[PDB]
Each structure stands twice: as structure tokens, then as C-alpha cells.
Amino acid sequence: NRNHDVLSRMISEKAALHGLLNCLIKEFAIPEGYLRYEWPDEMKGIPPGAYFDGADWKGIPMMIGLPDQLQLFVMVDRRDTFGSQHYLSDVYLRQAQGDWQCPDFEPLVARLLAACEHIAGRKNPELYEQILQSQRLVSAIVSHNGRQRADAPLQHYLQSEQGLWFGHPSHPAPKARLWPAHLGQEQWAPEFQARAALHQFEVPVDGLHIGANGLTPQQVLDGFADQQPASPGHAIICMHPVQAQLFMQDARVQQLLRDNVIRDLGQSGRVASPTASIRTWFIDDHDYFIKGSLNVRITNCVRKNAWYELESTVLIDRLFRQLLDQHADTLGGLVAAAEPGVVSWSPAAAGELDSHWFREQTGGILRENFCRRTGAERSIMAGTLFARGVDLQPMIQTFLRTHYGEALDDNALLYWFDDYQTRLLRPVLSLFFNHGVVMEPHLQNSVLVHQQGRPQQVLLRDFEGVKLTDDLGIRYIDDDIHPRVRQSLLYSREQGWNRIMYCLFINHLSETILALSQGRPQLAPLMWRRVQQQLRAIQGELKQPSPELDALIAGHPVACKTNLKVRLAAEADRQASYVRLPSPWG
Amino acid sequence: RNHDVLSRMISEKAALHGLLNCLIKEFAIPEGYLRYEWPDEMKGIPPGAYFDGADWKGIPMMIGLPDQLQLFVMVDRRDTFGSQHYLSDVYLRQAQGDWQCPDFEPLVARLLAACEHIAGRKNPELYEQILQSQRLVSAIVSHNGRQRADAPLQHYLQSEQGLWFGHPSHPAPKARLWPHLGQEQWAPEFQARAALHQFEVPVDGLHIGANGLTPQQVLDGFADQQPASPGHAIICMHPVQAQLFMQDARVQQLLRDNVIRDLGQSGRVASPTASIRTWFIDDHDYFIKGSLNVRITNCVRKNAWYELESTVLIDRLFRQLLDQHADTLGGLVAAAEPGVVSWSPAAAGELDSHWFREQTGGILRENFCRRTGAERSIMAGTLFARGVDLQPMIQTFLRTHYGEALDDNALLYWFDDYQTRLLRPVLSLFFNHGVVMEPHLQNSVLVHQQGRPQQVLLRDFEGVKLTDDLGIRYIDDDIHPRVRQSLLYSREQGWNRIMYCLFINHLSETILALSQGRPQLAPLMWRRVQQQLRAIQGELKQPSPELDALIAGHPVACKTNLKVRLAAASYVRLPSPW
Ligand SMILES: Nc1ncnc2c1ncn2[C@@H]1O[C@H](COP(=O)(O)OP(=O)(O)OP(=O)(O)O)[C@@H](O)[C@H]1O
Ligand SMILES: Nc1ncnc2c1ncn2[C@@H]1O[C@H](COP(=O)(O)OP(=O)(O)OP(=O)(O)O)[C@@H](O)[C@H]1O
Ligand SMILES: NCCNC(=O)C[C@](O)(CC(=O)O)C(=O)O
Ligand SMILES: [Mg+2]
Ligand SMILES: [Mg+2]
């Protein structure tokens, strides 16, 4: 206590800062050539213990020269073309002709953001308050969770969803969840092991829109809510309780409640636990996750399911089922969580705009609870797998050492990594080049299934992000689908490849390698070399041309989605959503 | 980036740690200026100084100094003797200011001023001695960066050459002011070798002490006597002392008149040891110790006539005690000093005669490596020192010998064996015989068998004193009063030196070195000291009230090196570890 409060705070500040640094380095410093691995000519202001341990340098100096004559100095464990490194010192800043200084968290955040706002020519004070608000939540999170082993999040599936203490490791405000403050934060936060009874409404069956593959409409309904309380001619639907509050602000909803067309049944649904995506709920031993709309910003978008996404979910689920059934030999060993049921409600007499609004508000998706198959103690969300614990150390190190009974030598780490990366790259690249199916295989859409620590599967999830290429993938959907649903699913071959590149190498594998190679940066080139060899090998298996894979293998730059830059640039500035980072090889 | 900058930074950290040791032991602890507490206000202290990402980097230590000056540093342990590992840079704050981390020279200046204020006294040369000491350490680290950091522990002479940082609680451990002669040619830390300087002198001016050796054999131990003409002998000297010697008008006269002959650097090629003016020759029966008119740590390292005489008497006493009373000596291992030589003109007046004798003074020390083995014998100061990477060298030394990382019990058992072999002989000699050794780190040599402590050899008869109530009775009534005076300590003076040397200078450093990364082992080690003291007391043949009081947990005398140098040897008291 008290000492625990300062400590939790300092831990949250270091973690939040490291995420902000990640963004600065990946999105600005590297692509625009502001970064040098050099010592400042003058060090005044920087204390000897920042960079010298008594025998040797604490890693490699990193200097970033920014506008307004601002320079940043920090010590790092490695040079890395993707901006993946461990920071071995406090951040020092020097302004024009002043000395090096070490600012407190808020002033440091302010100055770094101001620098990026200068490069952008645009300020975003909302983002600034979100960075601070995210850090404050993380402080409460660390303070709440200082009880267990630092690697406890890796021991059970739900604990792995709950134990992403720090969130997206390269986002400026990973924990900012933008719903009315009076609704509270901790009540909804997997990081506080949140549980709640889902909110329920009773609605007339004539406004239901049910999508179902290998289930009856009634089984889809049952998957969300027990239908017993429903009167004849009605069904029960469920909703995030925050969403239900948002939903009921609307005049159209107020009118239906007043006219007794729908009934508000309160928080009377299944008691369930939010996962890391906040609006998807886990129930131990239920056949399904419940994914609902939440019309709120979390990281870089509003977490609502648009009507055409509710429609597209059904088609994509149907597609994956046919691919796994008839085309297993061109899917690279794909393991994916199905999304067999979708529900939404709108009043039957509603015009199109109101119908669409109602369907987005009430939209729900059933995802196969894979833990029934894979086992709760064998399944770990990959973001948490490659994350830092409450002690700010990669949790994977002790997880593996426990499972392997001993300290893993270089070979054991390389071998583990090889098993991990093949299971990720093969299904994704096979889907993309053979069938034009664009997954979004970032860390949160990926779940490691393991056997005594050893990788068996990388299960992939989230159909709502899945796209189909103009040249290959889009052929797989009917001619008679709504034009808007088609538009929703359609990506160019190039759009698809940019997303796959970022998700696979920068978001996912780069974090994999950084976590595994902590204390041993020399392993990173070797791991990336194994990736390059794996790509060459997958290319051999492919049934369709893969010129994109040629260029990547040949060392051409890799697309990197921005998380900070997008929030500074105009919404109309499409270019700011990506940058290019040098290849790990060449 | 450079090894030059790294070396400077290593030397500055070493030098500063040594200075903190003095501040904490000599001032902060006995005067109650020390608190293990966090400052209410941390502004200026960066997070990384005290916080590693998960926890605090040890324990905060605060010291309140004069004129509203405060010092902050993180340490690995609370320690009543002031023995801790420093885990952060030092931060200073004065008056209405923020915490600040000054460069080395500004830091030394501010800390020295504070100590000048607490002490009242000022030594104008000290500041420059501190800096010159740090600069030499920088050159030393720079030169010695190719070896395994624990190389100094592999061979006796390497242990003597490998005390890179010197006395660990001294403001200027490596301060040496040579008359245009260079540091490196005389520096053990640069593996220096030189032929000794030699003079042919007439035998009528010789003063030779000899025990178990003839006067001629003593002569032979210093120098091959073949080149000497009839009625003459060859003596040797430090080459630097030889140059200083010959700058004297009295000496130039004798040379001009051909009474003595300068034979140049024609003597034995030898290697200076850690003490600078004692030379080692592998394969020779003797070290050669000579006078040198240069200050090294606290003393100008020259030996006066009565000190030359007392060496002979002490050597004779140790032979008497071993011949007749070995069973009350506690397993004593000591390097004999069987020969002493000096020369002065036969005609000379007392004043001149004394000057010449001190100038030409020479002592033979038994080369114990002949019986203990060069690869088995390690000077204790180096054994418990930090290597060029500032890691305690004993950790890797022990690991290699035990074939594995030593667990807690292994360290504890090694320590127990070590401390018993130190404490027994020293306390037996003091209590049974009134003989006061000076068993500090440089006067002790571990003899080990595959790393297991066998004996702690003690040396340096010049340091040996005899108590007024017991030891001095071994001195015959026909001894010159000045020689008896040089030997005499009060029983209380004797005990304070023994206390300081055994527990604070020596075993505190032993424990600190062995227990890096494991501060919890310290009190356990200190508890074994206390148990061993009880055991030893039971063996004693004479009253030991002083030992009762020590076992009982009463304060321990600590010699003040910084104050000594500020003064240009008083004792403070430090709380018992038990
Ligand atoms: N490394 C990461 N990369 C991407 N998203 C991450 C990462 N770590 C945590 N997240 C979080 O996971 C969510 C990912 O968005 P995505 O659209 O893939 O999930 P969803 O559709 O909201 O939910 P589900 O995966 O349950 O369908 C976001 O809330 C994001 O903040
Ligand atoms: N921890 C230590 N305690 C005491 N002296 C030390 C220590 N470390 C290094 N020394 C050095 O060892 C010497 C100790 O002085 P002392 O008077 O015992 O030796 P000496 O008579 O000059 O030579 P010798 O020991 O060779 O006879 C000094 O040069 C001193 O700087
Ligand atoms: N006979 C006196 C000679 N003793 C020393 O010279 C030892 C010491 O005083 C150091 C010390 O005692 O800690 C020094 O100045 O290095
Ligand atoms: Mg997702
Ligand atoms: Mg000595």
C-alpha cells in the first residue's frame, strides 16, 4: 500500500511511454529518417548511470532529431528496422541550446506529441487527454493485479484475455474506452476480471434478422439468451449493458418502450466476462462467445457492427466452412473460430435508415467457443502471450522455462519460434494467394493452442475484418448480394497485401521475436532469417502466383499501419494510415 | 564509445565509491547523519536512478551534511560498518534546490568541503591527490582491459599487481607523487620490473641485523656480493630512492671522494608489489623491502633506524614463540624477516647517521611462495577487490574452483573457514602474548587448496607492536630506549588497531565481496564471527575482557583515513553488527 501506489504508477508510466515511443519510432523516426544509433557529442544533463553500468554501455544509444530543434536520447538493446527494441534507459530530451533533461511523464508526453503534431501540421488535444487517461487506467490495473505470479495471465484462456494489462503495445492510448464516464470503467474491464449479466430486451419476432449456418434460427437465439421469458410472438435479445444505455438515449427507442412494443428487461441475461476486445463476452463452458455492438471508440475505431457487416459475417462463415471442407489442401493447415449465428432487430415497418440504425445497435454475433475443442488451459491469446507482466518483463520467458523444466538455450528458442511462425504464416498466406481471402492476423485475432508450452495451432478469428480480393476472393460470393455488402467485403489485391504484411510481420511476428529475444538480441536476425526461409517454402506450396511474396523475400519495404499518425491527419488523408519500414533482411 | 571514456568512467565510479565509504564510516554513521529513507521531494532524481521497471533498486540512503547539503544514493543493504554496494549515481541537493547529479570533480569538491566543515581542518593538497588518484586508476583500467576480470586471483604476483583501485575506504588510494620518473616504470599495476639500484659501500659503515643467517648471508640475499672489493659490500635500493639519495650533498661528497661507488641499475631484476617499495623475485628466497621517500596512502614509505632495529627483534620474537609456545599461537602462519641492512659513514654524527640509515635501509622478507605456492597464494586485498569490470573477483574465482555456482551454505562455509584462520592467530597473539599484529587486507595472504582456505599468512613486522602490560616484557633491558619506544603500544591502542583491522578493514570487506547479490548473507556471516569469537575466547590462556565486551555487542573502533589525511590516527566507533 501507498508504496504500492507509487510503484504501480511508475510501472504504468514506463509502459505507456514505451508504447508512445514505439509509435514515434515506427511511424515518424524510421520512415522519415530521423533516427541515429549514435552518442550525442555533448552529454551534459544525462547522468552516467543512464547509459553506463559500471563496466560497459547499457546497450546502444538511439538519437532522434525532431522539428523545433528537439532531440531525444534513449538507450536500446538493439538496432531494428521495424522499431522493435527494449528501452534500457529513461528518455532524455534536449531543446535547441539547452542541456539534456529527463521530464516527468505528462510533460514528456506533451512534448513528444507536440513534436508529432508539428510533423503533421495538426494538433489533437483529444488524443493527448486519451494518452493520460489510458495511463491512469493502467496504473489502476497494475495496482489491482499485483497479487499473482507475473506470468499467471498465460495459464488459462480467460486469464489471457483479462491479462493484457498494457494493451496494444504500439498505440498511444491502448486503454482509452470512450463511453460516458458515469457508466464507470472497472465494471467493464477484463483487467479487473469484470463480470456482468448482459442487458436484455424483449422484441417481436417480426423484426428479427437472423443469420445461421448449420444452426436453426431458434438455436442462434438460444445461443445469446435463454428464450423462456419471451411471450408468444417475441424473442429475447442481449446487449452490452453500456450499449443498452447508449441505445436507450434514442427517441426511436424511447418511443418503442413507451408504446410497449419492446420491453427493457434490465441486466437479466447470461453472466459473462468481457474479453480483451471489450464487446465480446466469454462464458466458461458455453458453446459461444457473444459479440455485440458497442458504439464507442476503442483504439482506432468505433466498435459497432454495421448492418452490411452483420450480413457479410454470415457469408464469410459460409465461405470458410466450404474452404475447410473442400479445399483443405490449399489452406495451409487453417484453424479458425467459426461465426455460425448472427442476430439483429429492427421494427418491421421502419424505413431503411431507421432499420439500419436499429440493426447496428442490436447486432449480435455468435463465435464458436474454441475452448470446448482446444482446452482452457491450452489456449492463450497471442497479444498476452507476447506481452509484459505487471513487473514489465515478457511473460513468455518464465512460461516456457516452467513448461520446459529448464532455461531455454538459443536452439530451444529458435525451434519454438520456428514452430510458432510456420503455424501463423502458412494458413494466412495460403488463404490470401490461393483464394484471395484477406485475414487480419494481428495479435488479438490470434490464439496459440499449445501442448506443454509447444505450439500446436495458431487459431485465427474475427470474420468481420475479413476481406476478399477484387481479382480472386470476391468471386466466391453470390451475384445477388446487396451492393453495399459487396462493397464492404471488397479489397484490392494491393490493399489486402498491405494489411497482411503489417499484421503478420510488424504487429505480430515482430512482437513475437522481441518477446522471445529479450536479453538475447542476437537471436532476432536468426529468427527473421527463419521467417525468410519459411516464406520461400510456402511460396513453393502455393497454387497461384505470388509476386508480392517475391518482392518481400527480396527485401523490399514492409507496409506498417499507423496508430498515432492517423489521429493527427485529416480523416480525408488516406496516405497517413500507412508508412513503409525497411525489410528485416535484404 | 571509446575504451578511454569507459576507463575514465570506471575510475570515477571506483574513486567515488571509495570516498563515499570514508564519508559514511568516518562521519555519517558515528555522528548520526545517516537515514535509510526516501526524500519527501524527488525532483531532479530521474526514475531510472531508483526504479528498475518492477521494483525499487535497493534501499534509499540519505545523509544530512553541513550548510543545508543533502546526499541521496541507493544501496543494497543497511550496514553498521558502512559496507554496502551502491546501486545508483550520487545525487546532491542544497538549500532550496532540486536534486542534482554533478560530474566527478564538482562532486568530489562538494563532498570534501562538507567533510572539511565537519572536521574543522583542511589539507590543501588533498583535493588534487583525489583527482590524481582517479586519473591513475583510469590509466590502470585502460592498460589492464584484455584479461579475464579474475586473472589477478590466479597467481601470487598477479594478485599483488592486480589491486587496481587500492585501499577501498581511502580518499586517494592511488595518489603517488614521484620526484620526471614516470608512474608506469614503478607501478605494480603496470606489471613493472626493474633492476635494483646498487652501491658499493665500505663494511665499517654497515649495520646488519640477522636471525638464523650470518651477516654475509643477509648481504647475499639483497645482492650478489662478488663485484665488491675487499673491505666492501654491495647494497641495493629502489631506483627512485637511489636518485633522491644521490641528490644529497653528503652523498655527492662520498662519491666524489670515492668512499662509496654508484653501480647503477645493476641489481636483481624484480617486480614491485602492492606496497610499491617491496620487491618480488620469483625463485629468490626473499622479497626485498627498501625505503622510499614518497607518500603512499597515509605514510611516507621510509623506515627509520629504530624501525630497522625493531624488525630484527620482532623476527627473533616470532622464532622464540614458535620454538616454545606454538600451542598458544592459534595456528599462526607468518612470513619471517630474518635480515636487515643499512649503511652510514663510520665517522658520521648522530643526525647524519640516522639520515643515511633510513635512506639505505633494507629488509629481507621470506619469499613464502617457496613453501605456500605461487598459484595458491593471494593477497587478501585483491582477493576481496573488484576487477576491471567493478565486479568482486572472488565470485568467479569461487565458481571456477567449486565447479558450480556456490549456494548459500557453500559461501557460509567458505567464509567460516576463512575468518577462523584470520581471527585465531591474531587474537591468540594479542591475548596470550601481548603481540599486536596489523592484520589489514594488504598484510594478509590467503593460502588456498583448490579455493578452500588453508591458512591466512600474516606479514609486515614493521607494523608489529608490543603491549605495555604483556608484550613489551619480551624486550631485553639492554635494548635502546628509542627501539623499545617504537615497539610500545598500550593494551588499549593494541586492541583498537586489532578491532579496526580485523572487523572493519578486513572481514567487512570479505563479507561485502562474498555477499554481492545476496545481502541477506551478511548478518549470517557476522553471526559466525560472533560464534567463533566465543570459541576462541575459550582457548585463551590469558584474561580477555576486551573480547567479552566485543562479543557482547559493544561498538567497534574504526580508523579514520580521510580525517588522517585531512589532518596531515584517530578512531571513531561503529555499532556492532550483532
Ligand atoms: N497488438 C494488437 N493489435 C491489434 N489490436 C489489439 C492488440 N492488442 C489489443 N488489441 C485490441 O483488440 C481489438 C482488436 O480489434 P478487432 O476489430 O480485431 O476486434 P473486434 O472485432 O472488436 O473483437 P473480436 O476479436 O472479439 O471480434 C481492439 O479493441 C484493440 O484495442
Ligand atoms: N585494505 C587495505 N588496508 C591497508 N593497506 C592497504 C589496503 N589496500 C591497499 N593497501 C596498501 O598496502 C600498503 C599497506 O601498508 P603497510 O605499511 O602495511 O605495508 P608496507 O610496510 O609499506 O609494505 P609490506 O607490506 O610490503 O612490508 C599501503 O601501500 C596501502 O596503500
Ligand atoms: N604501521 C602503519 C602502516 N599502515 C598503513 O599504512 C595502512 C593504512 O594506514 C590503511 C589502514 O590502516 O586502513 C594506509 O595508509 O594504507
Ligand atoms: Mg478481433
Ligand atoms: Mg604491509
Author numbering:
A (entry chain A): 3 to 588
B (entry chain B): 4 to 182, 184 to 572, 578 to 587
Quote the passages of the study that discuss this structure, keeping the authors' original sentences.
The first NIS synthetase to be structurally characterized was the achromobactin biosynthesis protein D (AcsD), from the plant pathogen Dickeya dadantii (formally known as Pectobacterium chrysanthemi). AcsD catalyses the enantioselective desymmetrization of citric acid via adenylation of its pro-R carboxyl group with ATP. The resulting enzyme-bound homochiral citryl adenylate reacts with l-serine to generate the first committed intermediate, (3′S)-O-citryl-l-serine, in achromobactin biosynthesis. Structural and biochemical studies have characterized the first step of the reaction in detail. These showed that AcsD is a new member of the adenylating enzyme superfamily, with no sequence or structural homology to other members of the family.
However, growing crystals of AcsD pre-incubated with ATP, Mg2+, and ethylenediamine showed clear additional electron density for a molecule larger than citric acid in one subunit as well as density for ATP and Mg2+. We interpret this density as (3′S)-N-citryl-ethylenediamine (CEDA) and were able to refine the co-complex. ATP, Mg2+, the protein, and much of the citryl moiety of CEDA are in the same positions they have been previously observed to occupy in other co-complexes. The difference in position between the citryl moiety of CEDA and citrate in the previously reported citrate/adenosine/sulfate complex occurs in the regions occupied by the carboxamide group in CEDA (this work) and the pro-R carboxyl group of citrate (previous structure). The carboxamide group adopts a rotamer different from that of the citrate carboxyl group. If the carboxamide group did not do this, the ethylenediamine moiety would clash with the α-phosphate of ATP (and AMP). The ethylenediamine moiety of CEDA sits in a shallow cleft and makes several contacts with the protein. There is a particularly striking bidentate hydrogen bond interaction between both nitrogen atoms of CEDA and the two oxygen atoms of the side chain of E442. The side chains of R501 and K563 point towards the ethylenediamine moiety. Structural data show that AcsD uses E442 to achieve this recognition by making a striking bidentate interaction with CEDA.
